[PDB]
């Protein structure tokens, strides 16, 4: 997260740290993801799509910092690791970036809710907010283009959704963007999501409940003047998502 | 060829 705030997992408790195992066993983080029910963490495709061995990955929930516990956490193993069979990438663009990872814990238990652990609620069919609502997005991704390690602290900012018109735009991102994907932006270009964000939630308020409207998935550099956040449309995904879990 | 930021984590080619 460029700019934004650093934040604390109990005002993000739905956010998932996903992290792989290495040949080696070194542990490297990967990507955020979204708790939607107690068994199931929904994150991007383009995350696992290198390294598609389910053993690999350790989630854990109720996790506020990189690399130190926090009280409360839990970690927990995937079960089963579903890719969008139809995911492909382009030169910027990243197409069915969504994915699902079914989680259990060494006992063999799902997620257990708690003041840190908690489910946030999908989207309804082709309903989102409306274009200049204010959503958040969390993750443990870059601060800064010049970091070379991921912060410590979990972090939060505020965007704004933009049009598809607007983001398909020359300057913008063109035909390149499609109406499967929603882009949000801060109106100064001073806070956005970057590298190491992709797979984590953008929650809107719609109709007076926090909703997972959207999936981190690209964008041209970060917090680049004309050039959004792109974010996979959840509201677009739920035959896919029902038929998955 | 592949590009940085969002969309390349986790890549051979990052």
């Known amino acids: 997260i460029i700019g934004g705030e650093f934040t604390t997992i109990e005002n993000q408790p739905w956010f998932a740290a996903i992290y792989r195992r290495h040949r080696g066993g070194s542990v490297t983080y990967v990507c955020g993801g979204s708790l939607i029910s107690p068994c199931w963490v929904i994150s991007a495709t383009h995350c696992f799509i290198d390294y598609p061995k389910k053993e690999d990955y350790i989630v854990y929930l109720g996790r506020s910092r990189l690399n130190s516990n926090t009280q409360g956490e839990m970690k927990f193993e995937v079960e089963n690791l579903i890719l969008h069979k139809d995911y492909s990438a382009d030169t910027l663009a990243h197409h069915n970036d969504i994915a699902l990872l079914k989680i259990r814990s060494k006992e063999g238990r799902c997620a257990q809710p708690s003041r840190t652990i908690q489910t946030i609620a999908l989207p309804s069919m082709y309903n989102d907010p409306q274009f200049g609502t204010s959503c958040e997005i969390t993750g443990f991704g870059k601060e800064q283009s010049t970091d070379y390690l991921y912060p410590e602290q979990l972090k939060m900012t505020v965007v704004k959704l933009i049009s598809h018109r607007e983001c398909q735009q020359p300057h913008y991102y063109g035909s390149e963007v499609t109406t499967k994907m929603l882009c949000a932006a801060d109106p100064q270009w001073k806070t956005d999501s970057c590298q190491g964000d992709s797979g984590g939630p953008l929650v809107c308020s719609l109709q007076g409940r926090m909703t997972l409207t959207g999936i981190v998935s690209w964008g041209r550099g970060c917090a680049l003047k004309d050039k959004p956040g792109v974010y996979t449309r959840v509201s677009h995904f739920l035959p896919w998502i029902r038929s998955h879990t | ?14």
């Open chain 2, 1 to 14: 060829g592949x590009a940085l930021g969002r969309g390349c984590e986790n890549h051979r080619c990052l």
